[PDB]
Structure 1
Amino acid sequence: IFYLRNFNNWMKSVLIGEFLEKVRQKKDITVLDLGCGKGGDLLKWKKGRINKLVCTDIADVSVKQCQQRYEDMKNRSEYIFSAEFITADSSKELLIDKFRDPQMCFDICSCQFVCHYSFESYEQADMMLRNACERLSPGGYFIGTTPNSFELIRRLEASETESFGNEIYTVKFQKKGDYPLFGCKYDFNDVPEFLVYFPLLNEMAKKYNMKLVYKKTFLEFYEEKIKNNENKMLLKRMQLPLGTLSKSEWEATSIYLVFAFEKQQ
């Protein structure tokens, strides 16, 4: 369990940091962490020296864990951002209606391992994308990590059943051979997720004046980003390709992709 979560932390680290550098090339960094969980990315924002962060999640128990983690860091002379915490279903509720400041603006929306939950339906996928995008400033960024639908199906079609995996993970599709845009249900060991067809996410984000910066598979992102010595030293410290992970860990990790979109002027 540890090694993978750690590789995923490194992934989000390198992803978050590139877009904070990109952000800062244009003269008070305000960030929306959408589906923030227990606050696994609070330190990344702290290290990035953002000034404001809104943390929101469907699970109140996790948001309260996020809030306590934050109070702990704050309680323990060094700079920390101010933070707003909201328990909401971002696929059914409108965050503009929840913020203290409805007309608040964000420089980044980070959406890490969350989007696949909103694709239960069109209304939900579109709502979570509005929430992510409508308040980004011109030039601001929508960044995330979600399973690559191409790799799920590849592995589905190779399989003798509706299931596949190794000792680390299991995928179990509800149905096989049928891939609707919305509602394409699978299990991933433990909640139900829904297939995210990336061409459809890309297209759908044009409604909120967003152009794709890049989509990379995890393996592609890994091998490009290891070439930066600073990203590589970070991996060194925090810890198919040969080393860094096992065969089985690359197998689990290689399911995912990384994306970045930009609000246009």
Structure 2
Amino acid sequence: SPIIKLRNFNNAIKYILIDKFTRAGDVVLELACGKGGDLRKYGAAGISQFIGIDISNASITEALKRYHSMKNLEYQVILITGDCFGESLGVAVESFPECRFPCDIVSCQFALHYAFETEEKARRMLLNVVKSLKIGGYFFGTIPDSEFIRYKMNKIPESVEKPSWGNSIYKVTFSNNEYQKNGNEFPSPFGQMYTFWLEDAIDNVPEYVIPFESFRSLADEYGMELELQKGFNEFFVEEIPNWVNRFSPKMREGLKRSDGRYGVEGVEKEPAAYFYTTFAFRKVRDYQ
């Protein structure tokens, strides 16, 4: 089962990415925060307030349960059940006036691509982000890498009805081959759907491509400029020397490969390190 090693790798990526842009005293808004599993990472950066929002009440209930189990934190934690992509964020936070907006950081891990189901949702997400963020603040996170996806798709001929690739532990299957029928181009940046099988994975939902060039050009339209687009492989290799020994002994041990180097290995390398990319934008102007 690859789940344990992949979870450790993603936790290392998130730890490094959070530290890269988050500063002590910051207010953080985390979109689609899930079960709130990055609280100690933001605590390590010394934040002052965490606001986490997820559409799943079950996941927010678990985040509440995990948070209340911790003791004497120096930062406030706010956890909200709400829709970050298909509705104005004002609806979600209306009943939470303790939120300190505008915030310093908007983060979103393994979830922003769901906002690309439609153009309306992608734009609502982006307007949500820039309305919450201070000028100068950062928007960062982790998403499936549309450029690796297009590489794999360009190797698949039009004769394949449901373009697919993978290895012993994962498989991507697209709903249709309109990409290939359209001369190896998505007919629309939005609504390009696939499923993702991972061995021993605990969830399965419709996935959507987030074409990075469309992401970047919409973000610019809403006042944000690109700061970071490194794939997980390059991001980890570049950053790990400076971090190996800053990690806890347990985090370091969980990252060990069979050869004693750090990261993932074998069949885990492609789904864990090539399929995903980091992103970061800085809000440089107000949106008109």
TM over 0.5: yes
- CA deviation profile, 1:104-152 (whole Å, cap 9, x unmatched): 2111011111111110100001111222222111211100111111211
Are the equivalent residues in 1 in contact too, given 2:27–2:100 (CA < 8 A)?
no
Give the equivalent residue in structure 1 for 2:195: 187
1:236 aligns with 2:255: no
Are the equivalent residues in 2 in contact too, given 1:58–1:88 (CA < 8 A)?
yes
The 4+ residue runs of structure 1 with deviation greater than 2 A are 100-103, 156-161, 230-239, 241-244
* Structure 2 residue identity aligned to 1:95: L
Once superposed, what is the RMSD of the aligned Cα atoms? 2.0
Q: Whole-Å Cα distance in 1 between the matches of residues 102 and 77 of structure 2?
A: 14
Give the equivalent residue in structure 2 for 1:131: 128
Q: Whole-Å Cα distance in 1 between the matches of residues 89 and 146 of structure 2?
A: 28
Q: How does 1:29-44 map to 2 (within 5 A)?
A: 29-44=26-41
* Structure 1 residue identity aligned to 2:139: F
Are the equivalent residues in 1 in contact too, given 2:55–2:82 (CA < 8 A)?
yes
1:164 aligns with 2:165: yes
- CA deviation profile, 1:14-68 (whole Å, cap 9, x unmatched): 0001112xx45xxx42111111011111111122221111110111100111111
1:258 aligns with 2:266: no
In the superposition, the TM-score normalised over structure 1's length comes to: 0.89
Deviates more, 1:86-95 or 1:2-11: 86-95
Q: How does 1:208-227 map to 2 (within 5 A)?
A: 208-227=222-241
The SS at the match of 1:70 is helix
In the superposition, the TM-score normalised over structure 2's length comes to: 0.82
- Which of 67, 76, 80 lines up with 1:82 in the alignment? 76
Q: Whole-Å Cα distance in 1 between the matches of residues 107 and 63 of structure 2?
A: 15
Give the equivalent residue in structure 2 for 1:46: 43
Q: Whole-Å Cα distance in 1 between the matches of residues 174 and 41 of structure 2?
A: 34
Q: Whole-Å Cα distance in 2 between the matches of residues 159 and 4 of structure 1?
A: 27
Give the equivalent residue in structure 2 for 1:249: 268
Give the equivalent residue in structure 2 for 1:176: 177
Q: How does 1:75-154 map to 2 (within 5 A)?
A: 78-99=72-93, 100-101=96-97, 104-154=101-151
Give the equivalent residue in structure 1 for 2:4: 2
Q: Whole-Å Cα distance in 2 between the matches of residues 245 and 206 of structure 1?
A: 34
Give the Å deviation of 1:157. Answer: 3.4
Change (3 A) 1:168 1:80: farther
* Structure 1 residue identity aligned to 2:275: I
Are the equivalent residues in 1 in contact too, given 2:83–2:92 (CA < 8 A)?
no
Give the Å deviation of 1:86. Answer: 1.6
The SS at the match of 1:145 is strand
Are the equivalent residues in 2 in contact too, given 1:110–1:143 (CA < 8 A)?
yes
Q: Which runs of 5+ in 2 are unaligned?
A: 180-185, 198-203
Identity score, percent: 36
Give the Å deviation of 1:103. Answer: 7.4
Q: Whole-Å Cα distance in 2 between the matches of residues 233 and 140 of structure 1?
A: 26
How many residues are treated as equivalent by the alignment?
Answer: 255
Change (3 A) 1:17 1:97: same
